[PDB]
Structures are given as C-alpha cells and as structure tokens.
Curated annotation (Swiss-Prot), chain D:
Whole-protein residues included: 587 to 730 of 732
Active-site residues from the entry: 1 (charge relay system), 89 (charge relay system), 121 (charge relay system)
Quaternary assembly: Homotetramer.
Tissue: Expressed in the liver (at protein level).
Organism: Sus scrofa
Transmembrane region(s): none
Superkingdom of this protein's organism: Eukaryota
Gene (name only): APEH
Its biological purpose: This enzyme catalyzes the hydrolysis of the N-terminal peptide bond of an N-acetylated peptide to generate an N-acetylated amino acid and a peptide with a free N-terminus. It preferentially cleaves off Ac-Ala, Ac-Met and Ac-Ser. Also, involved in the degradation of oxidized and glycated proteins.
Family: Belongs to the peptidase S9C family.
Localisation per UniProt entry: Cytoplasm
Protein name: Acylamino-acid-releasing enzyme
Amino acid sequence: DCFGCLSWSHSETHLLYVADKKRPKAESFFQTKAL
Amino acid sequence: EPEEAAALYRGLSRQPALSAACLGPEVTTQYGGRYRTVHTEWTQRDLERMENIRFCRQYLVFHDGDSVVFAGPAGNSVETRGELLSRESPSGTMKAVLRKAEKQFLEVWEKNRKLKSFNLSALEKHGPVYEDDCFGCLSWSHSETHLLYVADKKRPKAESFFQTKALQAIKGDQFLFYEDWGENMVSKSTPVLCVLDIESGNISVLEGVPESVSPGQAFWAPGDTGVVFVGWWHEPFRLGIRFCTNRRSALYYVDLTGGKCELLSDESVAVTSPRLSPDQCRIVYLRFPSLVPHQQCGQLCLYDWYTRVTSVVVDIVPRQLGEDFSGIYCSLLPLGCWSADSQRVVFDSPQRSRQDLFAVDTQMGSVTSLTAGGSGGSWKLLTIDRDLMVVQFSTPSVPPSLKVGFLPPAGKEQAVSWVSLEEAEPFPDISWSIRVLQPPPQQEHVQYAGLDFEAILLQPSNSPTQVPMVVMPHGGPHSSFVTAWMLFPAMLCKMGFAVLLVNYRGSTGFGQDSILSLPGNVGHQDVKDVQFAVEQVLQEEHFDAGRVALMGGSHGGFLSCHLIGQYPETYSACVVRNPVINIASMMGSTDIPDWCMVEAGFSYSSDCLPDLSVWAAMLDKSPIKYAPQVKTPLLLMLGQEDRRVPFKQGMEYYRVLKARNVPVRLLLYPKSTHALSEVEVESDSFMNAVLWLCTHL
Amino acid sequence: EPEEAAALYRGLSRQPALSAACLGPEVTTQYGGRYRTVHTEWTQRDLERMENIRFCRQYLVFHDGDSVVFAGPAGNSVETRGELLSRESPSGTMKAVLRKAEKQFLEVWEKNRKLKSFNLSALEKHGPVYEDDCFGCLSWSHSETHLLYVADKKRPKAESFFQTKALQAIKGDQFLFYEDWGENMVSKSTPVLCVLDIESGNISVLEGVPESVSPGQAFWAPGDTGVVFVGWWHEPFRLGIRFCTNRRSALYYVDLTGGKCELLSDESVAVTSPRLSPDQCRIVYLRFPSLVPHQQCGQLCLYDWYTRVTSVVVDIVPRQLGEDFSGIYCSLLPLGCWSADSQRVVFDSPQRSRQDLFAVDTQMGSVTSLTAGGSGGSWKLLTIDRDLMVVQFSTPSVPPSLKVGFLPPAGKEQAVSWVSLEEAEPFPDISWSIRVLQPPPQQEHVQYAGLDFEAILLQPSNSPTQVPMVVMPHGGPHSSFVTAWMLFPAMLCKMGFAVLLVNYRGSTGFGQDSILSLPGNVGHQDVKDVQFAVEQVLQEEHFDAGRVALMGGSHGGFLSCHLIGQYPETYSACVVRNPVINIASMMGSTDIPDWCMVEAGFSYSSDCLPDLSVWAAMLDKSPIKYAPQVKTPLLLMLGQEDRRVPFKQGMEYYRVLKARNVPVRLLLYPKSTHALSEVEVESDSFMNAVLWLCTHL
Amino acid sequence: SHGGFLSCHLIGQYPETYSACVVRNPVINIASMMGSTDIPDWCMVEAGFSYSSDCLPDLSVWAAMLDKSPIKYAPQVKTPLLLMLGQEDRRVPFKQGMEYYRVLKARNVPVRLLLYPKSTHALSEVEVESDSFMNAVLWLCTHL
Ligand SMILES: *S(=O)(=O)c1ccc(CCN)cc1
Ligand SMILES: *S(=O)(=O)c1ccc(CCN)cc1
Ligand SMILES: *S(=O)(=O)c1ccc(CCN)cc1
C-alpha cells in the first residue's frame, strides 16, 4: 500500500502499474563457457 | 524364526567382493631390492544405509625378477564415492578419473595434486558418458597427451508451439521417439567417440563412422595415427544387448583427420573384445560364427597390423579337446592379457562345473590349463603386467580370496606358484560335491547321442537323519553354475537344507553340441533332465522325499512351473522370480523377439508376420497349458519396470491359479528391474523366500 | 587485466595443503628389514566445483631402528567424502570412522571389511556429534572394547497448543531459547560424554558431570577405570570460545559407574590440552595464569597420577629466555607428543617471526630448539610415535612439503636428520626478508621500555625501478605473521607489488611484556608502530612513495581506518574485510563483550551497567572520529551472518563516507561469516581486491 | 515495542506495584539502537535533538540518550518477566531484549525468554501469534 498501484485508462485500452527496476546481469570470474 | 534368519543374513552378507585390480610401476631401492604396489577395489553390501559401498586397498610385493620374495599390506581401506571409470597412464605417473558430482567431471591426478579438471556438461558437445562394459571405454594415448572415450550423441534443441519469447530450436519435436538398446540401457540410443586434449582442453567428436553403426570399445592405433573400434549394426531396429553375444558387429579403424573408415574383419558375424600387443604389432579378438544362440562357444582370432593377415588361433570345440579344455565361453577378455614377449594370451573360461585359467600360444595354437586337477574351485584373472598375474579364488564354502603369481616360461606353465595376498576364513559347516548324470536311452536324440550333464550338491557336514532338499535350475538357458561363492545357497545350507544346482543339457562349458541340442526342444527335454537328476539324487543319497522344494528365476521359473505342472505329486513348495509363462504373448512385449523364435525352433527374420502354425507351436510349449493341474503353494516376485520379461506374464499365471482357489502369494516391486539387484529389494525377496520355504517345509 | 589475474589465481591455488598424518604398525620382513606406513590427508581448492576437496595418500619408510634407510610412495591419491572424525586403534588393527551420509554413522574397519556400523540417529540418545577442535574428540579404550566421544545433549519433545491427535510432549515450549557458544558454533549449547560398546551396541551417557560445566577433550583413565576431561564454566552465560584461551575451565576425572567427579587442578584459571604418557603414569597440560587477554604466553604443567603432585615444567618468559625461546603460544599440543621413554615432550611454537620445533625434558625443565638457525621458515609437527616425527615445512616462497625424522637421544637433539617424503617446486620470483624496528623515544611507555617489533618484506626478485607497496597489519590484536606459505601475498608479489607485513607491539612470540603493553593503548600505539615501519621502509629501500596501499581485516581494518583517517596524504587505496568501527556500539551485539572493556583499559565484570566515562573512553578510541578527514578510495567487504563483528559497523562508516561524496565500493555476502572462507566468496573477494588495487595504483 | 519500553520503566521506578509483565520486542537502550535500526532519526527526535545526515557521535547526545533508557533501572527490577523476540526484526534489533535478559539473569530473577528465528517485528504469523498469545495468557494466569 506504500508504492503499489494498478490503474485503468479512461479509454480502457492500457493498464498502469509499478514494478521493480531491472538489474544488469552478472557472472563470476571463473565460469565455464560452451565451446 | 525371523530373528535367526536375519542374524544369519547379516553375518553372511558381511563378506566383501573383489571388482578390479591394477599394478603400479617398478621401483628399485638403494639396497638392491625391487618391489611394486597393487591397487584393488572391493564392494560390500550395507544394510544400515541399504547401499552397495565401494572401497579401495593397496598391497605391496617385493620380487626378485622371477619369484615373489615378500608380500604385505600397505595401509587401511578408504571408501570412495562418485567414481565411474578410471585408468592409469601407461607410464604410471598420471591417473584419469570420471566422476559424478549432478554433473559429470573428468579429472587428472599426478602425485599429491589434481592437475586438471574438466566440466563436460558445460562445453555441451555431447550427452552423458557411457560407463557400462558394453560400450564404455577410457583410453590413454601412447604420447599421453590425449584421452579417448565414448559419450552420447547430442540432440537438437526443441521447444513448444506456444512459448513466450522475451521482448534456432525446432517447434513440436520435444516428444520424438529415440530407440534405446533394451534392458539396463535406458536412454542409450547412439554413442559417439570423443577425444580430449589435456593441454588445451578442446573436445572433438570424430567423423567418418558409418551412419548405421554404434561404435564402442575403442583404443588408439599404433603410432597414434587413428582409432580402432567395434561397430554394432542397429538397422532396421536395435535388439537386446545384455548377456547376448549374437549381435552383428564388425571391427573398424578410422583416422584422426576427416577420412573414410576401413574394415578389418568380416561384416557377417559377431566380433568383440580386441586387445593390442605390448609391441604394437598384432591384435587379438573373439569371433562367434553364428547368430542363432544368444551364448555359444567362440573362436579366438588374430590379426597382423603390417602384413594384414587374419588367422584363427583357437577354433570351435564340438565336445571336448583333451581332458581340461571345452571351448571359450567368456564374453570379455581381461584388459591386460598379453605376456611380456607378445606371444601368449592368458584368459579364464568355464570347464564343466568349474572355472579355470588357460594360456594359449598364438604362434603354434596350443592351450595349457594353469589350474588343472584338484577338487574344484573358481578362478578369475584381473590383470597381468610384465608376467605378474593377479587372481581371485573362491569355492562354495570359501569367500573370495586374492592371490598373485608369476607366469612361468613357455613349456612349463603347469608349475606356477601362488602367494596369498588376502585369505578368507572358510565355513566348515558346508560340504559340496559334483554328480555326473547320464540320460536314459529314451531321453536321447539322434543328432547328438552320448551327452551327459552335471549337478552340484551342497549339504550340511556332520549331519546326525532325513533332511529337506531345494532344487535350483539356472536361467539362460545358455548359462551354467560354477563352483564359486554363492550367497543364498550358502545360507540355505547353513540353515539346514540340502541344495542341488542342476546344469542340464544346453549349458555353457560342455561343448558346442550341448549348446545346439537344446533349441527347438524346450519344455520337454530340460524338464525331464531336472526330474531325472532329482530322482537319482533322492534314490542315491537317501534324503527326505516328502520335503522337496523348487526355486528358480526367468527360464528357471519357466522350468519350475513346468515341473510343478507335469509332476504335481513331487514338490511341496515353489519360488519363482520373473518367470516366463506364455511364449506366444511374450513376443510383442520383450526387447529380444528373436529369442522366442530361436527357442521354439524357427528362424527369426525381420519384417515377419504372425502365422497360425508358429503361434500354435509356441503355445504348445508353455507351462500355462498345465495350469489346471497345479497343486503346490506358490510365491511370486515381480519387478514392474522389467523390460527383458514383461511382468504381466506372472500376472496371467497368478489370475489362473487364484481363479481355482490355490494358495498363492504375490509381491510386486514398483521400481525394480529384471535383476532385482537393489539392496532393499534383494534382502526383502531373500527373507520372504526363506520364510516361505521354512514355513511350508 | 582480469584474464591474467584469473590465470595466476588458478595456478597459485592449484597447490594443496597438509591437514593430518598418522603412523602404522611396524612390520618385520623375512630378509630382516623393518618398515612402516604413513597415512597423510591433504586438502585442495577446486574452482570447477567450487569446493574444498580432501584426499588421502600413503607413503612407506624402511628404517634400521635409529636411521631412515629408505622412503617412498605407495600408490595414488584417493578422494574421500563424508568423514568427520577418524582414529586408529592403539594396536593399529582397527579403525573408527564417523561419517555423514543426512544422518550420522559410526563405522569400524578391519583389514578389507567393515565389521560394524551404528546409526546414531536411530537410537535417539543424544543430538549431533561434535566434530570441532574445541570440544570434539574420539578415543579408544585400552582394551579396545569401547569408544568414547562427545555429542549434544538431548532436548525434551515439544508440541503446539493446537495439534490434532489421532482418533509426553510439553505444549508451548518449541520456541525456547538455547544459548550457543558463539562464532562458528551455531546450535552448540551443552555437550555430553557418550560411551559406545562395540560388542553389544548400547550407548551410555555418563553421569556425575557438574551441572554448570561443559565437558570436552576426554580420554580414558589408566586401567580403564574412568574418564578424564576438561570442563568449561558456562555460568551465568557463555562467552566466545573461538581463538580465545582466557575462558575459565578445569580438569576433572569421573568414574564409569555413577559417582562424584574429582578435581585435579585449580578452578580459577584456564587449562587445556591434556595428554597421557605412553606408560600411563603422568599427564601434561597447558595453563594460562590470567583471563584478561584473549591470547598470551602459557605454562606447561605436569601432574603425577599416583603421587598426586602438580609441578610447573615450563613457566612464563617475560621477554626472552636465551636466543631461541620466547614462550609457549600454541593453543593445542599434538595428539601424540611424548617420546618413547616418557621423559621428553615435543611441540611447535612461534619465535619472533618464524615457527620452530622445541623439545622439553620434564625431569629437569630445559628447552632445546630443534630447528635453530638458518634463514627462516615455518615448521609444523603432525605426530610422533616411537621417536619417529612427521613434519610439514614451508616458506613464503615454497609451498608446504612433507618430511620425516628420528628424534636423537637426550642431549643431542640438535643433530636431527630430515628425509624428504614430498617436495614442492619453489618460486624464484619472490624474495623475502625480515626487518627489525626500534620505536623512537617519544613512542615509549614507562612500564615496558626497550621493546622492538618486526616486519616481513616480500619483493619481486631481479627487479629492473620504482614499485608500489601494499601494507598489511594482522588482526588479533594478539596474533602474528610467520614466514609460512601465504597465498594472497604471493599473488601480490608475483603480479608486481611489494608486500610489507607488520608485527606491531602486542603480537605473540615476543614475550609477555609485549602482550601486556598493548591493552589500554589501542588506536594510538599500534597505528604509530605501523606508520613508523612504513616510513622507515620507504626511506631505506627507496620504493615509489606515490603508490602505497593498505589492506587488513577485523582489527586490521580498524588499524587501516585509523591510518587513512589520521594520515590522509600517504595512502592511495584501502581494502578492509569486516572492520571494527565503533567500539561503544559493538558491545551490545558481539559475542565477546569483554574484549571491548579489556582493549579500552577497563576490567570486565558480569552484571555491569553503562557508565558515561567508560562509553566516552570507548568513543574516543574509534576511527569514526576521523571520518570527516578521509580522502582515500575505499572498498568494503561484509558478511551478513557474522557474529564476531556485526556488519552494521561497516555500514555506519559507509553511510558517513557516502554522505560526503567519497568514492566507496561495498560488497555484501548474504550467507557468509566472519572468516569468508567459502571458496566462491574467497575467490570473488580476492579478485575484487586485486582489481581495485591495480586500477587505483 | 515503545509500550514495552514504558513497561520496563514501570517495573524499574515503581517496583512494588506490579506482579507480572509481558513485553514483545521492547526498546531497552536508545544509544545502541541508533546504529542498528532503519530509522536513526527516531532516536534523535525522541531524545530532543534535531536529526541531520553526515552527523557524528557526541558525548552530550549519547549521555542524554543513555539517561532516558530503562536499563538504568535494571538493578531494581523485582517482577517476573516474559520476553518474546523476533530474530529477523529490522525495526528494533533483537539484541536490545538480550541485554535486559542478561542483566536480569545475572541477578537471579525469574525470567522466561522466547525467540522466533524467522519472525518479524509484527509477529503476525498465525502460528507465532497463537503461540505468543497462549504463552502470555498462561503466564498471566499462573502468576496472578
Ligand atoms: S532369464 O534369466 O532366464 C533370461 C533368459 C535369456 C536371456 C538372454 C541371454 N542373456 C537373459 C535372461
Ligand atoms: S579480528 O580478526 O581483528 C579479531 C579480533 C579478536 C578476536 C578474538 C581473539 N581470537 C578474533 C578476531
Ligand atoms: S514500536 O511499535 O513502539 C514503534 C515505534 C516507532 C515506529 C515508527 C513510527 N511508525 C514504529 C513502531
């Protein structure tokens, strides 16, 4: 109830909500890659 | 009482078993003595964790070049976990290990460090690695720079028609059918040969293998120029491969670079087990002339690498060659089988009711028995390197023991001296003997006349005096009983019974004529042989004729059902594991459809159709025909996931017997297989069988 | 570049480490020679599976009674899995193993068979078995009929108020609080002594232990009449036990039958590590006179079993006793430490900046150094049996190596000959030396005048010539750096840096006065010692003064923060792992509240209350006071599940620095601990630290 | 929480009035609560000072914070106490109650402690709430 929401458009064609920001992918220094 | 039986089972199962052995490099001391180490692998049941544990132990041998000066142990036992295949380098300085830890890893060990490790799953060049004895292998190069093994062919990626993509792969091919190789080979369709470079780490899949063959049992060619392997034909469809040596196959050689395969044998029969000489000049392998019987006497053949000439070293023995040889029946030669001079080959083979060690000179073609004479026993050869052999010896009253020896020079192999590395305490409460039985004139066929069979009798020593008897025929039907350490017969003998194991006509170790006599006569020839043996033993030894029981599995269950159907006033109990009841309906559900035709007396051909005459002949030889006359209490054990013998075969017999109000007990294991080799399953089945036998007798 | 750093890290971490060793029984050959086997355990990091693997290897030694004729290997390396504790029987014929397979099992091995196995979880007499070096133990009886170990006390069963019963246990007690022993001892509240009978299989928990003590480190009394153990007081509440030797404890003996415990020492100080003589006549142990410092010089004391007389064999050394001894600082004696004659005791101890082996005669009280002289090095004693010692040797430029030797007779211990069992290839690109530093007259205290400290300098050999430097102070603060094989300093030296490890005043191995000087002066004496060492090294060796970096952990992080706060124009980079920032707020969250009072200069007492003067004094000694003056880039690593140092301490510093726009990088490991000893965590932290250092320098 | 705070004060300044006490996640030491809570401004605001970022610890502020804590009256406590704590609480760290528990136990005072390893500040889980309420009612009825 602090940040969450879910709203309809006046034309009822789009929906609006709030999500979490995407984080860049990460990997370890010692990772085996496919040959 | 269940408590005493459980205590006896715990006591008897404590004995371990020997699986493999290898020899280390030679070391010379400053004083002048020379010694070398031996690594042995043992396996043992564990009822607390209900698992088969494996451990390793090391021994040390001081020798003077041609005699064993001293031998001893070199530490305690260490239990391993995860090892699938292992191999020591030719120089003995490096070791290659395949481990499951679930992913698969290939590790290289040297001294007290692990030099390199490769995660075969991450590279994604193939599937799971084969670890069985049919196709699996792991070989070092002569330069010790590359490794060769066999893996599963990679499958194209697949996806569903309705898959969400984020804001290549075939669609609708995730449920295609990939045929496997049958029993104990689930999800094993098409193997491929893989070569790994240790220094760099790149894995390469060899090209040039024919598109209609499965490769296996590969080793590096002389000079590291190519790879020699065995190709099994899998067209138009795959047949069963376990305990069957009548599958069409050939020997091929392929260059490392992209090139065409070269044929080295005849592409009409079955060949197997090729080994290369120490001097890298000749190869030896086993060839089987026909494809009708699943097991038969074989030929030992030699191939010269440079002159390209093939000769037959050891041929087929019809009945007997002398008094100690009857043919080659082993399906695999030892990994090391050549002598130091690259002239003689040492192996082990059944002989009547025992197992012996033989040495054959490839130059001339003579065969010499190394363990001739004596009361009996079972020998197994594990390895030989620089004329030093490691063997395991066991008798029905003695658990396996480990010995070493030196191979004498040519012409004096009969004077080999054995030194005991590990000895086991015998059981003096068991006495075993061998009986020879000659069939009556009525039960003889014109083609093969004069054949005789054998039985092994175990009884409690120092008996006070009427005792019960338990009769066991072997499966196969082309197999045999040998005078080795068997657990359940030992338990039955120690608990108070007398065990009679029958080797009827058609067994291995008695010649090719014995093998060829049985087919086409199942259901009336073996049944009579067992009945004659039982009657002769009862009339000779003067046992208690009122308490006789039967036990067998697979074809043994077939024979037991036939016996309790045709002679309903002789036996008082019966135990069967995965029996064969209806041959006609077994054709469409088993993985070896040719077995039914071969045993019924007809030739098997692909693209065949059901015929009334063939089906009537198959139905006339089934024990179900004698179902209404059954009067003996029966206990059945079935494995639901069995592919060799479908489990509905026993269900038909159970329903027929239950419809007539006959005492029948049934046990079904949902996740077990044909062998019932799981520790919990095996223990439960054995305890139930012994309780049934003691209660009804 | 990350690729070169990763390759270097792999190459350096490929080296293994030695953990334990034991000696087998003596064997006499027919020729006349005598030999025995040695079993060694090694551990090694594996980055493919990201795990610490453990394996075992066996060696063989031929001796003539007083000299080593020959030595060699006896096979390959075998990797084990699941072993927690193991012990060989006194006669050497049987082996006891504790395994986790998740339940816990106790197994007995003899020759090539596992005689017995016990599922300790099924009997339900206690909890999990202790396997640490603080309380864990596993002992054989003199008759080899019983086993003694330590387990967790059983808790009464509990259930909820609202539980459905089918148509005894306390209700509402499932969330009670059970206090544990602190860091690395999660869910370890109250241990108990357990005795197992091998023949029968019944487990018994001994009675008579005082209700306010925790028992540990137990062994059988002479004649198998009772059990001797060490009891740690846990009233009114438990304090931290890891790396702390100032915990009140005593030595007790209790009979097997129900009876009252007997006291054998003084119940006012800390005692530890009791060992019994081979002739079962006397005991030796370590005693610490005070409880204020967490680590200090100790006393070696002897107790006679029959005369019941206690004497002090080795006493406290204030500054120096000769030129090779400075006191006993090891917290544990070897499992086998007595000579064959039950007269001399062999151990290892730090000495200035090295680690040496010492032999002490209990009759007189003299101490002899076995590895005196030379350039330096680090020795560790693993075992001694029948005057045959097994040792591990390492230097900053040489990985650990394994050697054996024979103890000379009394009065000639300086002429011991070592025979190399396993040798490692050195790294010629590292050159190390030792510097001695004398503080200026201003930085001296009246009570202890004339003390000096040391540093270890590692540099790349054959340098062309301005190089950067990395300065490392140790934690503790009562610990030290020794000239042993360290991984990260070696990597930094090989990559191009010069490493300076400082042993400031207050370290172990320099006498009791050095230990006692530090407390009450933290924050202004240690910091200055490091600054003086850095300035002297820079002015002498003529390095690159523009590129100097700091690195440390725990108290090392404390010192690093103090250094970057008070001298903001000297260092250009800093790396800290779990630092201590605010002493005042650390009291209420750590498991050792007495540490803050002891270091701040006050006496610790239970049932104490916060006072303004004490809290002001604690706040005056914290690096946070110098936070506004920080100008150096900082990289922080924190473990969220750390109990020794709460992770909010670093968060306060991070917030303060970030509020002023200072370049700061922070890494948080959700499931790591104080040590950060996980393979993945350690590798990631080391790579991040090296990348930060190379980028900013 | 804060009410439990008050409760502790009520058993330190007036030790001859109440015969039982139950507290859930109380606040014991304001001075040491600053560095572990997620709302550091609360301590300054309640203690009478203005909160500003990039601040430093001062002797006067810390003394004022310590003078207002119930721990000062710990030696005078005479009432049986039952404590419930949630180990994964971020609003009020659970060591605050542990300090009070240790101080009271060092003087041989009847104290019962319950710790929920995976609970939070609210203790809103059904099992946790039911167990805590039943334990509280049993304690109250037994001691009254
Ligand atoms: S069963 O155990 O009698 C049986 C029959 C035939 C085969 C094929 C040959 N190995 C296997 C098992
Ligand atoms: S930290 O590594 O500086 C540190 C400080 C004090 C101790 C207690 C004594 N072992 C442990 C770690
Ligand atoms: S506790 O329940 O007393 C407590 C105190 C202060 C706050 C912050 C304002 N919501 C929350 C809970």
